[PDB]
């Protein structure tokens, strides 16, 4: 409990590390705004080293040294009452290469990662001849694929009857040993919601969702 | 969070150019799309084009020519032109967020300008 | 081209009634589309996205269904300030199309 880092500090009490391996003053535990999970929400996702990139101090790093080969650790928790129900989905996938709303095109930048801002599902498709967008249906879950076979990538169930929170270890997973940030990002993390929030009249009407990650042994 | 608002020039000359500059507050321009609908008391409402958060553009087929949408980042202003301002124009004009949750959904407006084009 | 056609006209009910309105389309829209509501001299307002979905402000009385062409609303129990406009909007490919918008006189 109560880990510290550089100068910042995180207080816990399960833990799943990567395909079985496991993985200097940026090694601070950067902490994304929340999101709000509602109702009827969706699902969320944010590529992974363009998250950093935009903000912290380890972004300046980023723009002096452009290749670099990092390891991450990623805690995520929501925190509700007893009175609260549903199901999460919390899974890392790596090289989420998602397909455009439009058949000929590809999707531009700015909608394929927010930075540090989470880019949202939907459950509905989307027009096609607009502009380069994301096909974001969740039931298809942007790849083309079946989402009730997601869990071969490393995941983790946050089921709020019992549990509550979700720690995850990734390894550095490339082909090439050395590559630019800037044009490559080799992961990607994903929460989707199963079995949606219900709660009665009476109780908070959301439930806020935080994401913390630091990275590991981070070389240039 | 306060929202967006914006200024036009309320009354014009018939067979010119317009300017209405709309200024947002609270979001950034990298994460949602601005969208111009003319309502009208003849016509009803009507959308016109909208800028995406990237960048890119759409108008509407019956207003080809004669609009130029465009915006900036760190000023956090859109600027349109609506152009050769004929007769039929006679309508209020907003200003209005989309991107509500993902969705391609007005979620927010302006306060509205009301314009007419004769002397 | 797509086309939203708004029915019926308008309605004159009193307080507190379940009240329906509807809307179709042209062609298939898959679920894609809002529901507006504009009072006199002022912004209109989102109440539910997605033909389902309802807002953050909105309160609980409103409902909305339909898949496919056929899409529409249910008020279950209207009150004071229920009148007003409404406005269905599909957002399914440009050109965004509008309803042709309904009143209430709440007699």
């Known amino acids: 409990r109560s880990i510290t880092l550089g100068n910042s500090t995180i207080t816990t009490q399960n833990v799943v590390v990567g395909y079985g391996v496991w993985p200097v003053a940026t090694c601070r535990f950067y902490t994304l705004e929340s999101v709000q999970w509602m109702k009827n929400s969706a699902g969320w996702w944010w590529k992974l080293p363009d998250a950093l990139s935009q903000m912290g101090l380890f972004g300046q790093n980023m723009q002096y040294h452009y290749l670099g080969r990092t390891g991450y650790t990623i805690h995520v928790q929501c925190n509700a009452s007893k009175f609260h129900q549903g199901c999460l989905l919390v899974v890392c996938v790596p090289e989420a290469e998602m397909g455009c709303s439009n058949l000929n095109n590809t999707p531009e930048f700015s909608e394929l990662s927010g930075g540090d801002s989470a880019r949202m599902f939907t459950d509905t498709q989307v027009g096609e001849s607009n502009a380069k967008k994301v096909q974001t249906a969740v039931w298809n879950a942007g790849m083309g694929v079946g989402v009730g076979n997601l869990t071969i990538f490393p995941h983790q169930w946050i089921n709020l009857r019992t549990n509550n929170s979700a720690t995850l270890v990734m390894p550095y997973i490339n082909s090439v040993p050395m590559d630019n940030m800037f044009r490559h990002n080799n992961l990607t993390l994903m929460i989707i919601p199963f079995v949606p929030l219900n709660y009665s009249e009476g109780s908070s009407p959301y439930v806020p969702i935080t994401v913390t990650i630091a990275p590991m042994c981070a070389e240039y | 969070q306060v929202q967006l608002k914006q200024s036009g020039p309320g009354l014009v000359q018939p067979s010119q150019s317009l300017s209405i500059t709309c200024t947002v507050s609270?979001?950034?321009?990298?994460?949602?799309?601005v969208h111009w609908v003319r309502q009208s008391p003849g016509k009803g409402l009507e959308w016109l084009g909208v800028i995406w958060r990237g960048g890119s553009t759409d108008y509407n087929a019956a207003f080809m020519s004669r609009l130029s949408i465009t915006k900036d980042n760190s000023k956090s202003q859109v600027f349109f032109k609506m152009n050769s301002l004929q007769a039929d124009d006679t309508a209020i004009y907003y200003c209005?967020?989309?991107?509500?949750?993902?969705?391609?959904?007005?979620?927010?407006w302006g306060q509205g300008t009301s314009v007419t084009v004769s002397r | 081209d797509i086309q939203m056609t708004q029915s019926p006209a308008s309605l004159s009910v009193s307080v507190g009634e379940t009240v329906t309105i509807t809307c179709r389309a042209s062609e298939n829209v898959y679920r894609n589309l809002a529901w507006y509501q504009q009072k006199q001299g002022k912004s209109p307002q989102l109440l539910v996205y997605?033909?389902?979905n309802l807002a953050d402000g909105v309160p609980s009385r409103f409902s909305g269904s339909g898949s496919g062409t056929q899409y529409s609303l249910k008020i279950n129990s209207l009150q004071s300030e229920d009148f007003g406009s409404y406005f269905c909007?599909?957002?399914?490919?440009?050109?965004?199309?509008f309803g042709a918008g309904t009143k209430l006189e709440l007699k």
């Open positions: 997605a033909a389902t």
């Open positions: 209005a967020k989309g991107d509500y949750y993902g969705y391609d959904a007005m979620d927010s």
């Open positions: 609270g979001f950034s321009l990298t994460n949602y799309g």
């Open positions: 909007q599909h957002f399914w490919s440009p050109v965004f199309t």
